[PDB]
Amino acid sequence: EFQVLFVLTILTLISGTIFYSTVEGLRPIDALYFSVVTLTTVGNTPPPQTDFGKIFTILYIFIGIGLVFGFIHKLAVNVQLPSILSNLVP
Amino acid sequence: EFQVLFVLTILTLISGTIFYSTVEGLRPIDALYFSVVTLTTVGNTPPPQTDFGKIFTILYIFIGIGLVFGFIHKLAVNVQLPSILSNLVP
Amino acid sequence: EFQVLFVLTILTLISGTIFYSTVEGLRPIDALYFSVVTLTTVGNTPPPQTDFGKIFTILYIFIGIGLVFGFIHKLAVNVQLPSILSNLVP
Amino acid sequence: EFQVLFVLTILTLISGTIFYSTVEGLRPIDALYFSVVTLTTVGNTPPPQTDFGKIFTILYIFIGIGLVFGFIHKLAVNVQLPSILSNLVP
Ligand SMILES: [K+]
Ligand SMILES: [K+]
Ligand SMILES: [K+]
Ligand SMILES: [K+]
Ligand SMILES: [K+]
């Protein structure tokens, strides 16, 4: 489960990195950062400058938000939870 | 279910597109982009400039956020999930 | 239930409106707008300029986010849902 | 439960405060503010300026969002709810 969500999230982020670095002309790290803060809904950046960028972003959000949060709802629920929970056992 | 949420989400976005293009003077694509990133809570844009725009946005968020996320909670749960899940069966 | 969440959300927004108009010097409508997009996590505005504003915002988010979304999870689930659901009955 | 989430959230915020004040050169209060609005997904600030800041932020979001919202889903569900609910009993 977690491994699958891990991979699916990775692929989604790779696609965004490739897209924004090419169409919005961002350095790869900035393209990855934009993809991440957009899909996690933080959105602490300016918006895309091109219409292609805006259209892709709209579709990218609808298709990737569900997945990204599914992975997060497992990274801290089936991985980070035990680490602390089980450890809270004297 | 999914088809209904699909339509409801579309209508909500059409209303926002019409509103922001008219009152905030945005090109249709920018009005749609603003509507989408606002309802999905990404918010990676400047805020509306007019009071009419601010008031509408407040009401638009409260009435459309629930719906938009309901659609997302189906687009990747009852459509994208099977595609990958069932496919994960050798 | 809905009526209570309605009132609780209103009081929370009134407090934010009063606070930001006074400490950040915003016009009431802008103070309300900031309160709303902050608690719904859209965040499509610049951040507070004063330290008092930043500290209050931190506390305001932690105490009001749960409530605001609880109200939203009722405004479209126990009010908007029936309107469309029941109506989807020929 | 609540006490644990309380502590875990505190530690996460302390780490962010230390990181952003050092690497992004922010005053402690601004570093704390950035950490808070980023993990709660409000994101009403400009993004980090350094690559180190961007990379850390990506990891910080994935590891801290689940926790922060878990705490919020308890601060208003097992603490703020009773205060109002039980009080709604004449
Ligand atoms: K958000
Ligand atoms: K934002
Ligand atoms: K911004
Ligand atoms: K923003
Ligand atoms: K946001």
Q: Which domains does chain B have, with CATH numbers?
A: 1-90 (1.10.287.70)
Q: Would an 8 Å CB–CB cutoff place B87 in contact with chain C?
A: no
- B27 phi-psi bin (left φ>0, alpha ψ -120 to 50, beta other): beta
Rounded to the nearest 5°, which phi and psi values hold at B46? -75, 165
Classify residue A63 by burial, with Cβ atoms within 10 Å: 0-12, 13-18, 19+: middle
Question: Which residues have a C–N gap over 2.5 Å right after them in chain A?
Answer: none
Residues of C in contact with B54 (CB under 8 A): 29-30, 33
Mutation choice for D interface testing from A34, A37, A78, A85 by most D CBs within 10 A: A37
B48 touches A36 (CB < 8 A): no
Cα–Cα distance for residue pair A2/A5, rounded to 1 Å: 5
Q: Per the structure block, which two tokens stand in for B50?
A: 């007019």
Cα–Cα distance for residue pair A84/B76, rounded to 1 Å: 30
Vertex B42, ends B6 and A59: CA angle to 5°?
40
B 16-55 residues with CB < 8 A to C:
37-38, 41-47, 51, 54-55
Secondary structure letter of residue C81 according to DSSP:
H
User: From the CA of B84, how many Å to the nearest CA of chain C?
Assistant: 29
Sign of the Cα torsion A39, A45, D17, C40 reads: negative
Q: Give the DSSP per-residue string, C11-42.
A: HHHHHHHHHHHHHS---HHHHHHHHHHHHTT-
Question: In angstroms, how far is CA C58 from the centroid of its own chain?
Answer: 14
Among chain B residues, CA nearest to C28: B51
D78 touches D1 (CB < 8 A): yes
Structure-determination approach: X-ray
Q: Give the DSSP per-residue string, A43-86.
A: --SPPPSSHHHHHHHHHHHHHHHHHHHHHHHHHTTTTHHHHHHG
Flag if C54 and D30 touch (Cβ within 8 Å).
Answer: yes
Ligand nearest to the CA of C69: 1
Cα–Cα distance for residue pair B54/D57, rounded to 1 Å: 30
User: From the CA of C70, how many Å to the nearest CA of chain D?
Assistant: 9
Q: What resolution in Å is listed for this PDB structure?
A: 1.6
